[PDB]
Amino acid sequence: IRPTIGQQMETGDQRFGDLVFRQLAPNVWQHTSYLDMPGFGAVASNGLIVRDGGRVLVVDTAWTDDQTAQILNWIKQEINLPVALAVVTHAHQDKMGGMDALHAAGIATYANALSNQLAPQEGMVAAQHSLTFAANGWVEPATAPNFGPLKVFYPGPGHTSDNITVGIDGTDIAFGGCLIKDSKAKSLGNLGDADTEHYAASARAFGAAFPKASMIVMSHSAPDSRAAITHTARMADKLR
Ligand SMILES: CCOC(=O)[C@]1(CS)N[C@@H](C(=O)O)C(C)(C)S1
Ligand SMILES: [Zn+2]
Ligand SMILES: [Zn+2]
């Protein structure tokens, strides 16, 4: 695909059906799925796959159940370990559109409690479990059982009021989801669900929560350096 929004395909990318997978680190891969929007073309959305010992952890579904089932198929082929859990980073179609494929496979799913509360209104299937957060934004660990290397952080409202972010312990990788755009981005996208007053602070909070991450993975750009966080925050400063 040659998406209008999202990175092009590069050497080292693997095509598996209509999905693209890229290894980012020895136990981390980016999954990419595409949704065609009329007149506007293909929009890429990225999530993560993490191998944690004898199990696999997933961050975000694909746009659709069928695509998300193909993520599970790719995992079976390339990793061949059971998927223990998935965490989805807000209640939009690119992040939660494939929940049914996860639940059909018996995979435990997790989301911000607010994401689960909003899911019906957003046309999404709620996750099976709800994460809650301390006042400093870090997940309450009782609500993130056996998350292994996944360090979940709620940076505050930005892209949506429920957006969460995930650091991958033992790697240089932090996932900003749809909150962060890369340093070449010209806009933060549509902003219809956004908190334009708090966006900038939330972007900076994400950077401060994962201060040593050097590879920033995001939903709608290829991985970038930490400049993606600052550039996003500075674009968000102009919304106030
Ligand atoms: C089907 C709903 O999914 C969307 O429309 C997203 C989800 S974040 N929002 C858009 C935006 O923020 O402009 C986008 C093009 C980045 S994908
Ligand atoms: Zn979104
Ligand atoms: Zn998105």
Token code pair at residue 166: 């995930």
Q: What is the amino acid identity at position 37? A: M
For 123, phi and psi rounded to 5 degrees?
Answer: 70, 20
**C-alpha of residue 68 to centroid of ligand 3, in Å:** 15
The CA-based angle 162-168-170, given to 5 degrees, is 160
Q: How many domains does the structure of the chain reveal? A: 1
Amino acid at site 81: L
Write out the two tokens for 97. 């559109």
123: tokens are 């046309």
Ranges assigned E (strand) in the chain: 14-16, 19-25, 28-37, 41-52, 55-59, 83-88, 108-112, 129-131, 150-153, 165-168, 173-177, 215-218
Distance CA 162, CA 88 (A): 11
Question: Would you call 157 helix, strand, or coil by DSSP?
Answer: coil
**Is residue 3 domain-resident?**
no
Which experimental approach was used here? X-ray
Residue 5 lies in a domain: no
Cα(109)–Cα(106) distance, integer angstroms: 9
> Which residues have CB under 8 Å from 131's CB, separation 6+?
87, 110, 111, 112, 113, 139, 140, 143, 144, 152, 154, 164
Residue 6 domain-assigned (yes or no): no
Residue type at 82? Answer: P
List the domain range (segments joined by +) for residue 45: 13-238
178 lines ligand 1 (CB under 6 A): yes
Taking the CA of 5 as reference, the closest ligand is 1
Residue 120 lies in a domain: yes
Q: Which residues pair with 165 in a beta bridge?
A: 153
The Å distance, Cα 193 to ligand 1 centre, comes to 10
Residue that is written with structure tokens 């007149």 in the block? 39
**Phi, psi for 150 (deg, rounded to 5):** -80, 115
State in Å: Cα 92 to ligand 3 middle. Answer: 7
Nearest C-alpha to atom 16 of ligand 1 is from which residue? 189
How far is the C-alpha of 27 from the C-alpha of 170, rounded, in Å? 10
Nearest protein Cα to ligand 1, atom 3: 93
Other C-beta atoms closer than 10 Å to the C-beta of 184 total: 11
Structure-block tokens of residue 216: 């920033």
Alpha-carbon gap, residue 126 to 103, rounded angstroms: 10
**Residues comprising the binding site for Zn(2+)?**
90, 92, 94, 159, 178, 220
Resolution (A): 1.7
Supply the DSSP string of 59-105, one letter for each residue: ES--SSHHHHHHHHHHHHHHT-S-EEEEEE-SSSHHHHTTHHHHHHT
Residue 4 lies in a domain: no
- The CATH number linked to 129 is 3.60.15.10
Task: Say if residues 18 and 33 touch (Cβ distance below 8 Å).
Answer: yes
Pocket probe mutation, ligand 1, options 220, 232, 235, max atoms within 8 Å of Cβ: 220
User: Is any ligand 1 atom within 6 A of the Cβ of residue 90?
Assistant: no
Numbered residues of the known binding site for substrate: 181, 190
For the beta carbon of residue 240, count every other beta carbon within 10 angstroms.
10
Ligand 1 site, residue 190, Cβ cutoff 6 A: yes
Residue 183's nearest CA partner among 239, 231, 221 is 231
Residue 7 falls inside a structural domain: no
Structure tokens at 84: 């223990």
| Ligand 1 pocket residue status of 180, Cβ below 6 Å | no
CA torsion sign for 193, 168, 32, 204 is positive
Specify the DSSP class assigned to residue 127. Answer: P
How far is the centre of ligand 2, averaged over its atoms, from the C-alpha of 89 (Å)?
Answer: 9
Q: Is 124 contained in some domain?
A: yes
